[PDB]
Design an enzyme around this catalytic site. Structure first.
Site, PDB file in Angstrom:
ATOM      1  N   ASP A  34       8.391  -4.806   2.616  1.00 43.64           N
ATOM      2  CA  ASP A  34       8.376  -3.840   3.714  1.00 43.64           C
ATOM      3  C   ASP A  34       9.087  -2.564   3.274  1.00 43.64           C
ATOM      4  O   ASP A  34      10.319  -2.489   3.298  1.00 43.64           O
ATOM      5  CB  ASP A  34       9.051  -4.430   4.946  1.00 43.64           C
ATOM      6  N   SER A  64       2.205  14.811   4.639  1.00 44.00           N
ATOM      7  CA  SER A  64       0.805  14.972   4.291  1.00 44.00           C
ATOM      8  C   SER A  64       0.355  16.395   4.597  1.00 44.00           C
ATOM      9  O   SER A  64       0.848  17.040   5.525  1.00 44.00           O
ATOM     10  CB  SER A  64      -0.038  13.948   5.066  1.00 44.00           C
TER      11      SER A  64
END
EC number: 3.4.23.22
Length: 330
Positions: A35, A199
């Site tokens: 994770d 992004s």
């Protein structure tokens, strides 16, 4: 040193991925959910409340000659999905794919929430976010990667998650045969303890690319892609019959639909998520309403590049003094 381990989807939807981990001496092999959005290595154990164990493999520290209680240390964690777990702490030898760390904090669960109990395929979590998020008190502990870093050939790990197929976690090296083209690296902020990056925009299907900054985290422990509501609305508007359902808890669409791809920007590069990757199947067995793999982050507080996005790429988690993230197509 290096390590390399295969990671395998737990079910036919790629809801999560499990990777075998050797703990203790002799080894006890548990299948852990790696994770990158958390920083505790915790396991089902001989100390877990018996009614809360349902088919998981447990770690028994008393059977490990290298286990030692970390005296006074406790842990307690709550995840973004509302699940939680807590317990005490041992140090022990932990190996992943041939890479061994001695003295790793292994957080033994005394309690786990129902969602963990109900998932017999996941024996615990291995956190790979920054150690500043580790929950052990009163002395915070280091992640497996942090402990291994100095020994690794290069201070990196890579995630290569499969679509309906196994993939690989590598530690300490870049497998240049595992991706196509080049790797585009992008800056990381560790201020929230996550692999947080920006992004450069998105496209829906064959549509034009929209240049816009989307801050979010690279999180292998989250199944879906959570993005701003404007972006998610633009995606589902291209699927006839798709709608956001308050009762179901997100966007659903007709199972008869063909989904468009979704592209996200990494610098000047582009990662394309095929439409199929966005189909998470019937909302309940036999339903013709299917659950979408792209969902709004508006209620989370952060955008999350979960498995839906990450499995479309070869992803480099560069743990150099100034960390960065790399993405390549594959």
């Amino acid at each position: 040193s290096t390590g390399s381990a295969t990671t395998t989807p737990i079910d036919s939807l790629d809801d999560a991925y499990i990777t075998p981990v050797q703990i203790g001496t002799p080894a006890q092999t548990l299948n852990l959910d790696f994770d990158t959005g958390s920083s505790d290595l915790w396991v089902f154990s001989s100390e877990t409340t018996a009614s809360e164990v349902d088919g998981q493999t447990i770690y028994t520290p008393s059977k490990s000659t290298t286990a030692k209680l970390l005296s006074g240390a406790t842990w307690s964690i709550s995840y973004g999905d509302g699940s939680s777990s807590s317990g005490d702490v041992y140090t022990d030898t932990v190996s992943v794919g041939g890479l061994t760390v001695t003295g790793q904090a292994v957080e033994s669960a005394k309690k786990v929430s129902s969602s963990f109990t109900e998932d017999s395929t996941i024996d615990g979590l291995l956190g790979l976010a920054f150690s500043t998020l580790n929950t052990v008190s009163p002395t915070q502990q280091k992640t497996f990667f942090d402990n291994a870093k100095a020994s690794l050939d290069s201070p990196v790990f890579t995630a290569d998650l499969g679509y309906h197929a196994p993939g690989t976690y590598n530690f300490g090296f870049i497998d240049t045969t595992a991706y196509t083209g080049s790797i585009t690296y992008t800056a990381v902020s560790t201020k929230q303890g996550f692999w947080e990056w920006t992004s450069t925009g998105y496209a829906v299907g064959s549509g034009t690319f929209k240049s816009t900054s989307i801050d979010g985290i690279a999180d292998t422990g989250t199944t879906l892609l959570y993005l701003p509501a404007t972006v998610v609305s633009a995606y589902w508007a291209q699927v006839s019959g798709a709608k956001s359902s308050s009762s179901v808890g997100g966007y659903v669409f007709p199972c008869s639909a063909t989904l468009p791809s979704f592209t996200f920007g990494v610098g000047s590069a582009r990662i394309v998520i095929p439409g199929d990757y966005i189909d998470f199947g019937p909302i309940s067995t036999g339903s013709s309403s299917c659950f979408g793999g792209i969902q709004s982050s508006a209620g989370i507080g952060i955008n999350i590049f979960g498995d839906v996005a990450l499995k479309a790429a070869f992803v480099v988690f560069n743990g150099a003094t100034t960390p960065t993230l790399g993405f390549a197509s594959k």
